[PDB]
Design a protein around this motif. Structure first.
Motif, PDB file in Angstrom:
ATOM      1  N   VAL A   1      32.941  34.054  46.385  1.00 23.48           N
ATOM      2  CA  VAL A   1      34.216  33.436  46.712  1.00 23.48           C
ATOM      3  C   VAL A   1      33.989  32.386  47.783  1.00 23.48           C
ATOM      4  O   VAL A   1      33.884  32.700  48.970  1.00 23.48           O
TER       5      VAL A   1
ATOM      6  N   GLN B   1      47.117  40.682  28.317  1.00 23.75           N
ATOM      7  CA  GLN B   1      48.009  41.640  28.984  1.00 23.75           C
ATOM      8  C   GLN B   1      48.393  42.808  28.073  1.00 23.75           C
ATOM      9  O   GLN B   1      48.404  43.978  28.488  1.00 23.75           O
TER      10      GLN B   1
ATOM     11  N   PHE C   1      51.550  34.539  43.681  1.00 29.50           N
ATOM     12  CA  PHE C   1      51.938  33.883  44.929  1.00 29.50           C
ATOM     13  C   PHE C   1      51.585  32.402  44.997  1.00 29.50           C
ATOM     14  O   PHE C   1      50.445  32.019  44.783  1.00 29.50           O
TER      15      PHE C   1
ATOM     16  N   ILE D   1      39.612  36.224  36.093  1.00 28.11           N
ATOM     17  CA  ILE D   1      39.514  36.774  34.744  1.00 28.11           C
ATOM     18  C   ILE D   1      40.245  38.109  34.598  1.00 28.11           C
ATOM     19  O   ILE D   1      40.539  38.540  33.489  1.00 28.11           O
ATOM     20  N   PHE D   2      40.559  38.752  35.715  1.00 35.88           N
ATOM     21  CA  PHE D   2      41.295  40.010  35.678  1.00 35.88           C
ATOM     22  C   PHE D   2      42.816  39.862  35.794  1.00 35.88           C
ATOM     23  O   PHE D   2      43.522  40.867  35.836  1.00 35.88           O
ATOM     24  N   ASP D   3      43.314  38.625  35.829  1.00 35.32           N
ATOM     25  CA  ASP D   3      44.767  38.385  35.936  1.00 35.32           C
ATOM     26  C   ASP D   3      45.653  39.199  34.984  1.00 35.32           C
ATOM     27  O   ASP D   3      46.662  39.759  35.428  1.00 35.32           O
ATOM     28  N   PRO D   4      45.293  39.266  33.683  1.00 31.94           N
ATOM     29  CA  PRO D   4      46.161  40.061  32.803  1.00 31.94           C
ATOM     30  C   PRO D   4      46.135  41.525  33.194  1.00 31.94           C
ATOM     31  O   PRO D   4      47.154  42.209  33.084  1.00 31.94           O
ATOM     32  N   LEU D   5      44.988  41.997  33.669  1.00 33.05           N
ATOM     33  CA  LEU D   5      44.887  43.385  34.100  1.00 33.05           C
ATOM     34  C   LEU D   5      45.795  43.611  35.310  1.00 33.05           C
ATOM     35  O   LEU D   5      46.605  44.543  35.332  1.00 33.05           O
ATOM     36  N   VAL D   6      45.658  42.736  36.303  1.00 34.09           N
ATOM     37  CA  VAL D   6      46.447  42.785  37.531  1.00 34.09           C
ATOM     38  C   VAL D   6      47.962  42.747  37.264  1.00 34.09           C
ATOM     39  O   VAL D   6      48.735  43.395  37.970  1.00 34.09           O
ATOM     40  N   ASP D   7      48.369  42.010  36.230  1.00 35.58           N
ATOM     41  CA  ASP D   7      49.768  41.958  35.791  1.00 35.58           C
ATOM     42  C   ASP D   7      50.313  43.314  35.336  1.00 35.58           C
ATOM     43  O   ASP D   7      51.504  43.590  35.488  1.00 35.58           O
ATOM     44  N   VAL D   8      49.437  44.160  34.800  1.00 37.66           N
ATOM     45  CA  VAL D   8      49.874  45.393  34.157  1.00 37.66           C
ATOM     46  C   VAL D   8      49.883  46.586  35.119  1.00 37.66           C
ATOM     47  O   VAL D   8      50.749  47.459  35.035  1.00 37.66           O
TER      48      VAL D   8
ATOM     49  N   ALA E   1      36.996  34.016  41.701  1.00 36.34           N
ATOM     50  CA  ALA E   1      36.043  34.960  41.115  1.00 36.34           C
ATOM     51  C   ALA E   1      36.728  36.068  40.312  1.00 36.34           C
ATOM     52  O   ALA E   1      36.206  36.519  39.297  1.00 36.34           O
ATOM     53  N   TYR E   2      37.916  36.466  40.752  1.00 33.18           N
ATOM     54  CA  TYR E   2      38.609  37.594  40.155  1.00 33.18           C
ATOM     55  C   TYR E   2      39.601  37.163  39.086  1.00 33.18           C
ATOM     56  O   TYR E   2      40.247  38.011  38.476  1.00 33.18           O
TER      57      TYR E   2
ATOM     58  N   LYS F   1      47.641  33.328  44.342  1.00 35.68           N
ATOM     59  CA  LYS F   1      46.644  33.624  43.329  1.00 35.68           C
ATOM     60  C   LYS F   1      45.518  34.449  43.943  1.00 35.68           C
ATOM     61  O   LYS F   1      45.300  34.408  45.155  1.00 35.68           O
ATOM     62  N   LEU F   2      44.833  35.222  43.106  1.00 33.37           N
ATOM     63  CA  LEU F   2      43.643  35.945  43.525  1.00 33.37           C
ATOM     64  C   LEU F   2      42.540  34.918  43.741  1.00 33.37           C
ATOM     65  O   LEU F   2      42.625  33.817  43.209  1.00 33.37           O
ATOM     66  N   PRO F   3      41.509  35.265  44.535  1.00 31.96           N
ATOM     67  CA  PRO F   3      40.333  34.391  44.631  1.00 31.96           C
ATOM     68  C   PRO F   3      39.763  34.115  43.242  1.00 31.96           C
ATOM     69  O   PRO F   3      39.817  35.007  42.392  1.00 31.96           O
TER      70      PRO F   3
ATOM     71  N   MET G   1      45.337  45.121  27.551  1.00 35.46           N
ATOM     72  CA  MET G   1      45.283  45.989  28.722  1.00 35.46           C
ATOM     73  C   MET G   1      46.288  47.128  28.611  1.00 35.46           C
ATOM     74  O   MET G   1      45.895  48.300  28.651  1.00 35.46           O
TER      75      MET G   1
ATOM     76  N   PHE H   1      49.476  42.258  42.468  1.00 34.51           N
ATOM     77  CA  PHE H   1      50.409  41.551  41.568  1.00 34.51           C
ATOM     78  C   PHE H   1      51.097  40.391  42.313  1.00 34.51           C
ATOM     79  O   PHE H   1      51.088  39.234  41.848  1.00 34.51           O
TER      80      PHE H   1
ATOM     81  N   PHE I   1      27.736  39.807  40.325  1.00 36.60           N
ATOM     82  CA  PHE I   1      29.090  40.150  40.718  1.00 36.60           C
ATOM     83  C   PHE I   1      29.920  40.485  39.492  1.00 36.60           C
ATOM     84  O   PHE I   1      30.498  41.565  39.402  1.00 36.60           O
TER      85      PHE I   1
ATOM     86  N   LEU J   1      50.202  38.910  45.132  1.00 36.51           N
ATOM     87  CA  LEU J   1      49.206  37.892  45.492  1.00 36.51           C
ATOM     88  C   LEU J   1      48.828  37.003  44.310  1.00 36.51           C
ATOM     89  O   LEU J   1      48.673  35.792  44.465  1.00 36.51           O
ATOM     90  N   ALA J   2      48.682  37.602  43.132  1.00 33.66           N
ATOM     91  CA  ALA J   2      48.372  36.836  41.926  1.00 33.66           C
ATOM     92  C   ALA J   2      49.493  35.876  41.566  1.00 33.66           C
ATOM     93  O   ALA J   2      49.237  34.770  41.107  1.00 33.66           O
TER      94      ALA J   2
END
Ligand SMILES: CCCCCCCCCCCCCCCCCC(=O)OC[C@H](CO[C@@H]1O[C@H](CO[C@H]2O[C@H](CO)[C@H](O)[C@H](O)[C@H]2O)[C@H](O)[C@H](O)[C@H]1O)OC(=O)CCCCCCCCCCCCCCCCC
Ligand SMILES: CCCCCCCCCCCCCCCCCC(=O)OC[C@H](CO[C@@H]1O[C@H](CO[C@H]2O[C@H](CO)[C@H](O)[C@H](O)[C@H]2O)[C@H](O)[C@H](O)[C@H]1O)OC(=O)CCCCCCCCCCCCCCCCC
Ligand code: CLA
Ligand code: CLA
Ligand code: CLA
Ligand code: CLA
Ligand code: CLA
Ligand code: CLA
Ligand SMILES: CC1=C(/C=C/C(C)=C/C=C/C(C)=C/C=C/C=C(C)/C=C/C=C(C)/C=C/C2=C(C)CCCC2(C)C)C(C)(C)CCC1
Ligand SMILES: CC1=C(/C=C/C(C)=C/C=C/C(C)=C/C=C/C=C(C)/C=C/C=C(C)/C=C/C2=C(C)CCCC2(C)C)C(C)(C)CCC1
Ligand SMILES: CCCCCCCS[C@@H]1O[C@H](CO)[C@@H](O)[C@H](O)[C@H]1O
Ligand code: OEX
Ligand SMILES: [Ca+2]
Ligand SMILES: [Cl-]
Ligand SMILES: [Cl-]
Ligand SMILES: [Fe+2]
Ligand SMILES: [Mg+2]
Lengths: 451, 62, 29, 37, 334, 342, 81, 34, 38
Positions: free
Chosen positions: B62, C4, A53, D8-15, D5-6, D1-3, C7, A48, B5, A50-51
């Motif tokens: 990446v 969000q 950041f 698309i999972f931002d909303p998931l990572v938020d939760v 490639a990942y 931010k995530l790399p 999810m 979270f 991936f 890192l995202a």
């Protein structure tokens, strides 16, 4: 469904976990699943952070508490704590998050599918709380584990890149520790230091050599103690001193954790070595001192002779003496004269702040830093409005030092409460009156009147 | 490689959701424990494999 | 935004769904 | 931010961080299902 | 029995008029020391330079104070969190000027009251009682710690600990409001719910029990004589009390279980006061009350004041006036 | 003698889920309107025309800052009836003039009367002594002194408390700055009664809970009590010995204990009420004259009392212009009281 | 008990929810529309964000006369052009 | 067996009906922008 | 019709979730639009 109602177990639903006291399999389950929850939070929260950041704002302007922990260990950062690579943060987060799955899998298994009690299944994993030798043995395994942990910190510092050192010559940077402090007079000298102002007990540790050496000592001590407890059984005096029951051992641990929590609160509040201000923001003392510094610089540029400037009270407007004579910043920050930080120390001589160095040697980076810290003081509202209580909305800021300190004070306190609760209960239950007074044998009724 | 991936990662998420619901239901279910147990072995193994696949593929996208 | 919430909807349903499935199957709650 | 490639999972990572809290509430759903016995 | 054993038996004796105990062994000297120093200081101490700016504040009766204005004044800001026992001073005159009595008193007191709590546990155990009265006492005790030790630690000075006096208490409250907006903090609000609620439930329980006392006396004698110390039967009819209260609100809002009821009486004020203490102890590290200054803004961007902004103006008055000679720079950062 | 009055009496006193009673005829409409007025005002209604404040969810306030605010100072002590000369039957204008404030204050007062009548009526029907109503006299003295008498003594309803969380906080601070209310011995007795009451609540609950007889097998001890049982559920004798040894004195008489639990918080609230009646007239405990004479002559004499007064002066000067808009205060910067730097 | 059907009976019955799955959302929607159509503003006389001040005015529309207060509010309102 | 429309029914609805309406209104308010 | 068909624990869970959602919306509203300070 063994023991899962009040009538059979003696405990209501709201004390339901007390039904687990003598169910080692399920209790193992609860513990492992809980560990899973902790590791899960570490992973998820890291991802979270890192995202959210932004690499070119200070970490402390962004509500981060775990990335600072990672960067302190030397991962991801460079000179002055600038982020040079976010990949280690990502790795830390993902790896914790994946491990949490393994832990939870185990926890759920032992909790609802595996043997409810372990004793019939295995003498090794089975235990009776009242078996003192087994208790000291498990205790020993865990001490060896902790010792190993401390030693992992050591290995990072000495052989795998080093640590972030806010005190590095030339400016804060990552640095390999080559000569850890092994001298016991230093190491345990910290332990005998007063906790009051200008001394500050172990919270005063101000260099990484001492930190690392301290961890070598703690690693060896924990491994040795672990071995000791695996090889021995409690002596007579200990046997007569303690209560020997699950709830008792739990209460002892609650006391220990409460103590540790208060300690961590003070550490994060005062210490700027293992909690570098680059990552966590300035300490309260630090920011106060920095205000003083900022106005000394401004006024002196205007032509003020700051050494001779008498303030309204008769004390120096900028500079005064500590109760032992050292030259310190004046104004209310007179209270914070024990503060030490790399941006201030070049102005310090044998008798304290040096007037010649002040007049002649203040560098633009010191001015910048003092401004930055003065304006990121750990003051702010619950809804994260930065500044004093009367400040208008505009700046979204509450210092990480405040979040960490407040959270750990609340937790430490409730843990002291829990210690009292479970210690008192453990005593009463061991003596046999935790459920109340025997009407036919009320102790006070057999006692002489007070008068 | 990028598509492999993306699919591997989506696969891992989906499978994780499946396991999160199904493992505790299976563990506490009275009937059909053998098929369930087998399925839990299969799911766990595939889960591990997918973690490793995403781990490796990470460095090629990446 | 809707992402969000989606999810947290599946994730949030996950828990009660487990209890429900076991309640229907007369499982070991 | 995530790399990237990942991403698309931002909303998931938020939760995700809130998930542990969901476990505490789940204890209560479970207990209600067995009548807080 | 040997001497040490007899001594132990006396210390832990259930037959002493006042229980001593091992906690009492620490409690008794510490509480006496704090008490004696507090009494002498309150009557006779000279003025103290609380803010370290050579501006001594008079706290004692003989130096121009009454009971309401009097205080033992906190130690000097020049001292900060430094330990300042008598023997750190060059002289008692110095010790006094710098506010040494304050540190002596609060440290002996906090130790002694911690021991008072322990002692409540200890006697509960000697008497075969359940042990948690001490837990109840943890609520006021934590509160004393908050204002005498935790707040000073967070702010970097015992000069900001609560003064030992009535008006000094009010001073501490007003400054706290200026600096933390404590009123707008949910932990203080829970504190108020805790004490208002406590007073409410105290009155309630008092009145219900009193309302349901069983007739045992005539009109020309106190109803209190209808209860006798140690009688076995309950002295009021709880079924009647519940019959009343359940109809006052509705049935399922009233307690019919005395144990449940008394548990509630314990829990509500205790938890609320725990949060009060935590409010002070977290504001100690400057995590403050909700700030809605200029939260409401019109279409152009004009500020539309709310009651939060009026509170803000009051807080500003307090802020700009407090310790009028002690600040040289524009921000009050502790 | 079975006429309509007795039939109605029968209906009113049916043992139903929510008891009604004759008192219910007064209580239910008045309480409902008071709560409804507050919820209605805090959700939808402004204080722009009376105070220059936003005060509703509609305007962007939150639960802590919403309020139903008092009418403008220019309204004086108008009852501000909807059909009154000010609003003239116009509902929108009535809301804008602060009519909901008096609506809530007045309906609330009659509602409290209703509730205490309810305590009497139910006590009488059930056959218990009426000490609950008696104890409720303290909330009544408080509401009446604070919400009615206090502003009736002042210029207008404007200076009554406005019904809201932050608004009430403002009331507290105003009383500090203008009235020095913390210095008032009536307030102080109030404080002693409230905190002493909370203390009694806590200590009594905990004592009962920790001198319980073991009346069952369970480790959770709540089930080992029966409402119909004759026996005390805890030991007064053990409680007494414990407290006698801990604190030196203890209760020995349960009837006295419970009466005292009534007496303490009820008496405290009553004393606070008396002090507020004084403040209605600005009859304050603001100063100690001896202190002021000494301080005026001697610039080195300083107490916590003088320090608090400097704080109050700050409060008055800095809060007045916005808090009292009808006075049209313009305080030039240079007259504002300030210490150094701040 | 006092004669009325126990709540736990009612809210676990199919009929209750047949009624209330309509009545509860309907009320919620009605309250929404009360705000979204802007009716609330007009009913209670609450300023919309563009109606606290005229474009160049910075003085509060404070009511200053008791008996002509209504007319004063009307005048303030007219002054928003 | 049990009646439907009682005093209790009335009380319950005098509270619950405006509550749900109010909650819908306050929900809509969350999307208002200056 | 007859009380019982819809289990009370499910009713409590759904009602609770609803409560959480609405209060959540209100907290979101603290940061956006009116009252947000922006
Ligand atoms: C078994 C029982 C054991 C206990 C029995 C009694 C033992 C004695 C009693 C202890 C009381 C200590 C009081 C002082 C606490 C304090 O001022 O603590 C502060 C110190 C830190 O001190 C500070 O430490 C600083 C160190 O930083 C220095 O070095 C740093 C290096 O980076 C920086 O450079 C920094 O700028 C520089 O100043 C400075 O020295 C400061 O001057 C100094 O004040 O914390 C510390 O020592 C460690 C933290 C102590 C824990 C806090 C206790 C809280 C207890 C709460 C009780 C609740 C009860 C509820 C009742 C129910
Ligand atoms: C115990 C608890 C029991 C249970 C509680 C039950 C609650 C019942 C509800 C009662 C409601 C009472 C409404 C009182 C309204 C009021 O007073 O309204 C006030 C009016 C007087 O009007 C005021 O008069 C003032 C002075 O004017 C006078 O002086 C001016 C200056 O020169 C001008 O000349 C002016 O023209 C002239 O009229 C100002 O004009 C004010 O703006 C104006 O509000 O009195 C009046 O209606 C009537 C005045 C006399 C009767 C008052 C008795 C009731 C109140 C007692 C409280 C004591 C107050 C003393 C303070 C201590
Ligand atoms: C960290 C929180 C935590 C943990 C780990 C536990 C663990 C436990 N509790 Mg306790 N409990 C808790 C909090 C917790 N509790 C709280 C907050 C309360 C108050 C509501 C209780 C009240 C309570 C009571 C009254 C009882 C317990 C009991 C138990 C034990 C047996 C559970 C059981 O039989 O359920 C059966 C439940 C099911 C079959 C439903 C599903 C359960 C699984 C675990 C859900 C897993 C979901 C997860 C996402 C799956 C991921 C899998 C993936 C990793 C592959 C177990 C060790 C019982 C006990 O002691 O028995 C001996 C018992 O009687 N608990
Ligand atoms: C050590 C604990 C801890 C600390 C110091 C922090 C600190 C922070 N978090 Mg983190 N976080 C935590 C645990 C913690 N969190 C947990 C458990 C979760 C899962 C819910 C998260 C998930 C999370 C998210 C999703 C976010 C944060 C964010 C943040 C930042 C802003 C916080 C804020 O505004 O709070 C607001 C304050 C509150 C919500 C007040 C909570 C009051 C509690 C309920 C009182 C509890 C008292 C006690 C425990 C109860 C005892 C009861 C008694 C009867 C016994 C701040 C740095 C934000 C951020 O900036 O990220 C970059 C953000 O978006 N955190
Ligand atoms: C401290 C946590 C812990 C403890 C004490 C136990 C103990 C037990 N488990 Mg459990 N379990 C756990 C966690 C734990 N488990 C976890 C995390 C999982 C998910 C992987 C499981 C999944 C699991 C299953 C499916 C089964 C058990 C079984 C058993 C029993 C047989 C053990 C044995 O014979 O191993 C023999 C010893 C070995 C095989 C060597 C293990 C090598 C380890 C894993 C290397 C790593 C060691 C290192 C210190 C770990 C650090 C981890 C840390 C970073 C978190 C024993 C009672 C069995 C059982 O209950 O049968 C009735 C069984 O069928 N466990
Ligand atoms: C004496 C024990 C001790 C102490 C004082 C410290 C202190 C520190 N650690 Mg280290 N560490 C320890 C043990 C300790 N650690 C162990 C066991 C491990 C393995 C888990 C580690 C692994 C570790 C890592 C990976 C890192 C640290 C870091 C740190 C620093 C920052 C974290 C902090 O604030 O902790 C505060 C410490 C405490 C709250 C513990 C105090 C314990 C008290 C003094 C004793 C309690 C004893 C117990 C109750 C009595 C036993 C019973 C017996 C008498 C019968 C700080 C200097 C960080 C760092 O150095 O950054 C560069 C860091 O990254 N530690
Ligand atoms: C979590 C870690 C842990 C725990 C829970 C235990 C638990 C125990 N140890 Mg072990 N031990 C440990 C780690 C631990 N040990 C380590 C790391 C070592 C290597 C140093 C040892 C070496 C060791 C030895 C040699 C012995 C024990 C013994 C014991 C038993 C009695 C201890 C006791 O009475 O303490 C209570 C403490 C006292 C009674 C000391 C007197 C009280 C003073 C005044 C306390 C003051 C401390 C102060 C407040 C601390 C604040 C900080 C300070 C440093 C300034 C108990 C089972 C004893 C035993 O029975 O062996 C079979 C024993 O002889 N341990
Ligand atoms: C039943 C309990 C009750 C009580 C005690 C009150 C009391 C009050 N209401 Mg409330 N109200 C109630 C229920 C109640 N209300 C209900 C159910 C509603 C919804 C319709 C309202 C709606 C409401 C509004 C909208 C307002 C009030 C207002 C008031 C206040 C002014 C009332 C007044 O002047 O009446 C005067 C009338 C009487 C006292 C009647 C006395 C009966 C006499 C003795 C019989 C003789 C009548 C005679 C024969 C008729 C001749 C008439 C002819 C000449 C035309 C007063 C505090 C006002 C207020 O609060 O302003 C701030 C206000 O604006 N009420
Ligand atoms: C016992 C019990 C309990 C508890 C339980 C628990 C506590 C459990 C836990 C569990 C757990 C602890 C779980 C975990 C899980 C995890 C997981 C499942 C994970 C996954 C992950 C993933 C899938 C990842 C992904 C990714 C990647 C790889 C990259 C980046 C992005 C992402 C994130 C997407 C209760 C209370 C209910 C009660 C009853 C009994
Ligand atoms: C990491 C990850 C993951 C994981 C996940 C998980 C692990 C989940 C879990 C989940 C869960 C674990 C959930 C839970 C939930 C719960 C809930 C949602 C609850 C609620 C509750 C309530 C609402 C309550 C109510 C009540 C009752 C019941 C009774 C009493 C009263 C009350 C009202 C309180 C996944 C797969 C996504 C993939 C990606 C990554
Ligand atoms: C106030 C109550 C006044 C009652 S009035 C009373 O009412 C009876 C029936 O209720 C009649 O039978 C009787 O004649 C009449 O005087
Ligand atoms: O000391 Mn007592 O009061 Ca806590 O802020 Mn800073 O310092 Mn002073 O000013 Mn504000
Ligand atoms: Ca716009
Ligand atoms: Cl002051
Ligand atoms: Cl200053
Ligand atoms: Fe009682
Ligand atoms: Mg909004």
């Amino acid at each position: 469904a063994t023991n899962r109602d009040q009538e059979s177990s003696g405990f209501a639903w709201w004390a339901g976990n007390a039904r687990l006291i003598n169910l080692s399999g399920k209790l193992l389950g609860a513990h492992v699943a809980h560990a899973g929850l902790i590791v899960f939070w570490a992973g998820a929260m890291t991802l979270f952070e890192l995202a959210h950041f932004i690499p070119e704002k200070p970490m402390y302007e962004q509500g981060l508490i775990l990335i600072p922990h990672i960067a302190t260990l030397g991962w991801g950062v460079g000179p002055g704590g600038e982020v040079v690579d976010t990949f280690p943060f990502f790795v830390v987060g993902v790896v914790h998050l994946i491990s949490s799955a393994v832990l939870g899998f185990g926890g759920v298994y032992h909790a609802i599918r595996g043997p409810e009690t372990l004793e019939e299944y295995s003498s090794f994993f089975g235990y009776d709380w009242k078996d003192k030798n087994k208790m000291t043995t498990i205790l020993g395994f865990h001490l060896i584990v902790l010792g190993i942990g401390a030693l992992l910190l050591v290995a990072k510092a000495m052989f795998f890149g080093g640590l972030y050192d806010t005190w590095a010559p030339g400016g804060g940077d990552v640095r390999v520790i080559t000569n850890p402090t092994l001298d016991p007079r230093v190491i345990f000298g910290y332990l005998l230091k007063s906790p009051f102002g200008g001394e500050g007990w172990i919270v005063s540790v101000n260099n990484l050599e001492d930190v690392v050496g301290g961890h070598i000592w703690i690693g060896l001590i924990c491994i040795a103690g672990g071995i000791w407890h695996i090889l021995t059984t409690p002596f007579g005096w200990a046997r007569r001193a303690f209560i020997w029951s699950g709830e008792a051992y739990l209460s002892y641990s609650l006391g220990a954790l409460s103590m540790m929590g208060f300690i961590a609160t003070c550490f994060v509040w005062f210490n700027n070595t293992v909690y570098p201000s680059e990552f966590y923001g300035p300490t309260g003392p630090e920011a106060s001192q920095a205000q003083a510094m900022t106005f000394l610089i401004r006024d002196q540029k205007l032509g003020a002779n700051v050494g001779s400037a008498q303030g309204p009270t008769g004390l120096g407007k900028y500079l005064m003496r500590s109760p032992t004579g050292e030259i310190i910043f004046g104004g209310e920050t007179m209270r914070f004269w024990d503060f030490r930080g790399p941006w201030l120390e070049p102005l310090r001589g044998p008798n304290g702040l040096d007037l010649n160095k002040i007049k002649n040697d203040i560098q633009p980076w010191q001015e910048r830093r003092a401004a930055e810290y003065m304006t990121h003081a750990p003051l702010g509202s619950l809804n994260s409005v930065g500044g004093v209580a009367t400040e208008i909305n505009s700046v979204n800021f509450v210092s990480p030092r405040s979040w960490l300190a407040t959270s750990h004070f609340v937790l430490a306190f409730f843990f002291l409460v829990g210690h009292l609760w479970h210690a008192g209960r453990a005593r009463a239950a061991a003596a046999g009156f935790e459920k109340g007074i025997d009407r036919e044998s009320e102790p006070v009724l057999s006692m002489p009147s007070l008068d | 490689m990028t598509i492999l991936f993306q699919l591997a990662l989506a696969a891992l998420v989906i499978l994780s959701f499946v396991m999160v619901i199904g493992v505790p239901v299976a563990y506490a279910s009275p009937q059909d424990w053998d098929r369930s147990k087998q399925l839990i072995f299969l799911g766990s193994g595939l889960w591990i494999a997918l973690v490793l696949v995403v781990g490796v593929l990470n460095f090629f996208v990446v | 935004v809707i992402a969000q919430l989606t999810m947290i909807a599946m994730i949030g349903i996950a828990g009660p769904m487990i209890i429900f499935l076991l309640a229907v199957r007369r499982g070991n709650l | 931010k995530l790399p990237e490639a990942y991403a698309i999972f931002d909303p998931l990572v938020d939760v995700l961080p809130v998930i542990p809290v969901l476990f505490l509430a789940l204890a209560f759903v479970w207990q209600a299902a067995v009548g807080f016995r | 029995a040997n001497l040490w054993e007899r001594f132990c038996n006396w210390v832990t004796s259930t037959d002493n008029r006042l229980y001593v105990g091992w906690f009492g062994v620490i409690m008794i000297p510490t509480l006496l020391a704090a008490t004696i120093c507090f009494v002498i200081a309150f009557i006779a101490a000279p003025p103290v330079d609380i803010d370290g700016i050579r501006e001594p504040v008079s706290g004692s009766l003989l130096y121009g104070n009454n009971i309401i204005t009097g205080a033992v004044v906190p130690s000097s800001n020049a001292i900060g969190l430094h330990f300042y026992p008598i023997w750190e001073a060059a002289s008692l005159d110095e010790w006094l000027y710098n506010g040494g009595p304050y540190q002596l008193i609060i440290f002996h007191f906090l130790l002694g009251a911690s021991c008072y709590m322990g002692r409540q546990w200890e006697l509960s155990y000697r008497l075969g009682m359940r042990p948690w009265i001490c837990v109840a006492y943890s609520a006021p005790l934590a509160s004393a710690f908050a204002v005498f030790l935790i707040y000073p630690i967070g702010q970097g000075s015992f000069s900001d600990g609560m003064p030992l006096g009535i008006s000094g208490t009010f001073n501490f409250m007003i400054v706290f409001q200026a600096e933390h907006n404590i009123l707008m903090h949910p932990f203080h609000q829970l504190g108020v719910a805790g004490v208002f609620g406590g007073a409410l439930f105290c009155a309630m329980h008092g009145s219900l029990v009193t309302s349901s006392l069983i007739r045992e006396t005539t009109e020309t004698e106190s109803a209190n004589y209808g209860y006798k110390f140690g009688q076995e039967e309950e002295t009021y009819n709880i079924v009647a009390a519940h019959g009343y209260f359940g109809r006052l609100i509705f049935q399922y809002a009233s307690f019919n279980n005395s144990r449940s009821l008394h548990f509630f009486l314990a829990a509500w004020p205790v938890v609320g006061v725990w949060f009060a203490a935590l409010g002070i102890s977290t504001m100690a590290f400057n995590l403050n009350g909700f700030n809605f200054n200029h939260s409401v803004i019109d279409a152009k961007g004009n500020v539309i004041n709310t009651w939060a902004d009026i509170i803000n103006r009051a807080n500003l008055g307090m802020e700009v006036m407090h310790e009028r000679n002690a600040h040289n720079f524009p921000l009050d950062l502790a | 003698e079975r006429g309509w009055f007795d039939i109605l009496d029968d209906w009113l006193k049916r043992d139903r889920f929510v008891f009604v009673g004759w008192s219910g005829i007064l209580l239910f409409p008045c309480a409902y309107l008071a709560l409804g007025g507050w919820l209605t005002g805090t959700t939808f209604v402004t204080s722009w025309y009376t105070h220059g404040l936003a005060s509703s969810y509609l305007e962007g306030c939150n639960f802590l800052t919403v309020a139903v605010s008092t009418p403008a100072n220019s309204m004086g002590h108008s009852l501000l009836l909807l059909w009154g000369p000010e609003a003239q039957g116009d509902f929108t204008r009535w809301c804008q003039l602060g009519g909901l404030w008096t609506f809530i204050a007045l309906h609330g007062a009659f509602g409290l009367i209703g509730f205490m009548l309810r305590q009497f009526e139910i006590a009488r029907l059930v056959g218990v002594r009426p000490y609950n109503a008696i104890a409720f006299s303290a909330p009544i003295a408080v509401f009446v002194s604070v919400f009615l008498i206090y502003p009736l003594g002042q210029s207008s309803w404007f200076f009554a408390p406005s019904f809201g969380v932050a608004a009430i906080f403002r009331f507290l601070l105003f009383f500090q700055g203008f009235h020095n209310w913390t210095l008032n011995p009536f307030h102080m007795m109030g404080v002693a009664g409230v905190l002493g009451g909370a203390l009694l609540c806590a200590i009594h609950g905990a004592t009962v809970e920790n001198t319980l007889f073991q009346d069952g097998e369970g480790a959770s001890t709540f089930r080992a009590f029966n409402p119909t049982q004759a026996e005390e559920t805890y030991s007064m004798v053990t409680a007494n010995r414990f407290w006698s040894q801990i604190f030196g004195i203890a209760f020995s008489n349960k009837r006295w204990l419970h009466f005292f639990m009534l007496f303490v918080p009820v008496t405290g609230l009553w004393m606070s009420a008396i002090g507020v009646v004084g403040l209605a007239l600005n009859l304050r405990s603001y100063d100690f004259i001896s202190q002021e004479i000494r301080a005026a002559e001697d610039p080195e004499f300083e107490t916590f009392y003088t320090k608090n007064l400097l704080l109050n002066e700050g409060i008055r000067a800095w809060m007045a212009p916005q808090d009292q808009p009808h006075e049209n205060f313009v305080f030039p910067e240079e007259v504002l009281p300030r210490g150094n730097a701040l | 008990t006092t004669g009325e059907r126990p709540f736990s009976d009612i809210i676990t019955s199919v009929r209750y929810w047949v009624i209330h799955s309509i009545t509860i959302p309907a009320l919620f929607i009605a309250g929404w529309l009360f705000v979204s159509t802007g009716l609330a503003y007009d009913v209670f006389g609450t300023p919309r964000p563009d109606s606290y001040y005229a474009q160049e005015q910075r003085s509060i529309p404070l009511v200053t006369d008791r008996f002509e207060a209504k007319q004063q509010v009307e005048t303030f309102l007219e002054q928003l052009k | 067996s049990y009646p439907i429309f009682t005093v209790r029914w009335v009380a319950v609805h005098t509270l619950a009906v405006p509550t749900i309406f109010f909650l819908g209104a306050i929900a809509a308010m969350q999307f208002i922008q200056r | 019709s007859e009380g019982g068909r819809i289990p009370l624990w499910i009713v409590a869970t759904v009602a609770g979730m609803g409560v959480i959602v609405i209060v959540g919306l209100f907290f979101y509203g603290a940061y956006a639009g009116l009252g947000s300070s922006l």
